Amino acid sequence: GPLGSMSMELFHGSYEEISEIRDSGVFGGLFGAHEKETALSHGETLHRIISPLPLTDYALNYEIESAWEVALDVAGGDENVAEAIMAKACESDSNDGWELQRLRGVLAVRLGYTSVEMEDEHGTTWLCLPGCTVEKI
Numbered sequence: 001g002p003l004g005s006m007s008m009e010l011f012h013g014s015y016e017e018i019s020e021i022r023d024s025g026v027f028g029g030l031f032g033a034h035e036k037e038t039a040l041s042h043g044e045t046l047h048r049i050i051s052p053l054p055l056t057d058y059a060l061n062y063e064i065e066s067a068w069e070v071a072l073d074v075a076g077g078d079e080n081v082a083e084a085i086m087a088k089a090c091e092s093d094s095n096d097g098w099e100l101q102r103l104r105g106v107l108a109v110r111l112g113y114t115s116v117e118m119e120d121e122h123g124t125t126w127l128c129l130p131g132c133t134v135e136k137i
């Protein structure tokens, strides 16, 4: 679909002023919240992130044919972590939670998306990957 037709609007708080979303950092992107108030609790400078096409958790597990094999390829064949990154919580007793979150971001890039539904203390947040637009205030 024409780019922008599915865009969702999120906010990111940081100490920096973000120009673009580099393929770098712990997660390979930025986390966005639905409420400006939530983003400000994470930083002083507020940003607007716009993901042209986000990947909902439902669409991941239920509407995308053979996403499991793609999650397997990014998990190095370890079917225990691939199972963990198909789900928002990104939880397993054997792996680092944030590396699970990063690998979940890799999934969406592989599947052709630019943000992924995530779970966190706030509730649902989104890992916004390169492809989104970030702009201050």
Ligand SMILES: NC(=O)c1ccc[n+]([C@@H]2O[C@H](COP(=O)([O-])OP(=O)(O)OC[C@H]3O[C@@H](n4cnc5c(N)ncnc54)[C@H](O)[C@@H]3O)[C@@H](O)[C@H]2O)c1
Pocket: 011, 012, 013, 014, 015, 016, 018, 020, 021, 022, 023, 024, 025, 026, 027, 028, 029, 030, 031, 032, 033, 038, 039, 042, 043, 119, 120, 121, 122, 125, 126
């Ligand atoms: N910061 C937020 O707005 C926000 C929103 C929702 C959830 N969270 C939660 O907080 C936890 C950690 O999130 P975080 O924001 O503090 O991560 P983080 O602070 O460790 O890394 C992100 C920081 O690095 C900088 N950065 C700039 N460009 C970047 C890029 N292209 N890739 C990576 N970093 C970049 C940003 O200033 C950003 O503040 C996550 O588990 C998430 O659940 C944070």
